[PDB]
Amino acid sequence: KWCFRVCYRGICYRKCR
Numbered sequence: 001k002w003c004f005r006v007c008y009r010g011i012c013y014r015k016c017r
Contacts (some may be wrong), residue, residue: 003016
């Protein structure tokens with residue numbers, strides 16, 4: 001699926017829809 005990467009406060013995570 002489409003997943004984007006969010007880097008928040010040093011925490012980079014993939015967020016999938």
